[PDB]
């Protein structure tokens, strides 16, 4: 019950790289999330943009390309 926030931040930073490749894992994690009433705001933003579409070019993108384009 104490490692919830750090694991959710790590999970959000991991699913930021994965695009639609994480959509198969969402009903597996959602059981554990609703079982212990775990709410994370950035993870909610990311799965809202994963399940319902945001655009077509940003989903399933190489993360090194994003890090290079945001470093410049």
């Amino acid at each position: 019950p104490e490692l919830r926030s750090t694991a959710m931040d790590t999970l959000s930073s991991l699913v930021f790289q994965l695009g639609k490749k994480y959509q198969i894992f969402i009903p597996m994690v959602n059981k554990v999330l609703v079982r212990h009433r775990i709410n994370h705001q950035r993870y909610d933003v990311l799965i809202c943009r994963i399940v319902k579409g945001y655009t077509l070019a940003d989903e399933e993108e190489d993360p090194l390309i994003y890090q290079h384009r945001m470093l410049r």
């Binding site: 959602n30 609703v34 809202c48 943009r49 399940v51 945001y54 655009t55």
Partner: protein, 235 residues
């Protein structure tokens, strides 16, 4: 797709191809936390809002202003409406090559479809928005004797994206009804005949939806049969 018109076209084609052949609840608490952290209701200053959180409130499944009758959500949608209207001169004045330009347009499209997601409670905002859009387009097209010339404001600012809203208003079956409740299709029909502005026909011919039979194909046929030769070639 780099653009946002072709993105909506491909998404609509994939959606109808999926629809031809066949989530969390968060009732009142997490919605209030998300609209609290969204920073819209705290201060009225634009460009300081958390637009990811706004997109997450507008694109969540079961919040649609029809089952959650809270006054804070009505304040939120009224502030977003007053920001997105071109008469208020807030969204329609930001120029191209902006830092956050595609995100505001995507949030605007999902907002004007979220307003349509409540077909019985979302008239008072949607009608005002589309009336302000057709007022701006009649003012800029040349249907008035004031100036009849604002090509320098449409071509370099985000106010050219107001066709995309009509685009994401044109896909749904309840969308064409609301679009014809105002004088939108007749406005484009009169827009088809003019000779000075060719960019507006490029904007309206690549935004509308021609999936079903209706008044959207009549505008396409009118551009294809009787228009400027360059616009006829592009159509």
């Amino acid at each position: 797709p780099y653009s946002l018109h072709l993105d909506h076209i491909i998404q609509k084609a994939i959606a109808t191809h999926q629809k031809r052949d066949q989530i969390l609840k968060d009732t009142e608490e997490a919605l209030l936390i998300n609209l609290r952290d969204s920073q819209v209701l705290q201060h009225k200053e634009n460009l300081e809002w958390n637009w990811n959180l706004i997109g997450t409130i507008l694109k969540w499944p079961n919040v649609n202003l029809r089952n959650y009758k809270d006054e804070q959500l009505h304040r939120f949608v009224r502030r977003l409406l007053y920001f997105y209207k071109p008469s208020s001169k807030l969204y329609a004045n930001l120029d191209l090559d902006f830092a956050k330009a595609k995100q505001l347009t995507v949030v605007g499209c999902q907002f004007t479809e979220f307003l349509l997601e409540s077909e019985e409670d979302g008239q008072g905002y949607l009608e005002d928005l589309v009336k302000d859009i057709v007022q701006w387009l009649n003012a800029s097209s040349g249907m008035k004797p004031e100036r009849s010339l604002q090509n320098n404001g449409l071509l370099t600012t985000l106010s050219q994206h107001y066709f995309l809203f009509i685009g994401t208003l044109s896909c749904h079956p309840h969308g064409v009804k609301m679009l014809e409740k105002c004088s939108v299709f007749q406005c484009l029909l009169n827009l088809c005949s003019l000779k000075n502005q060719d960019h507006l026909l490029k904007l309206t011919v690549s935004s509308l939806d021609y999936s079903r039979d209706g008044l959207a194909r009549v505008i396409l046929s009118k551009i294809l049969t009787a228009a400027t030769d360059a616009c006829r070639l592009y159509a």
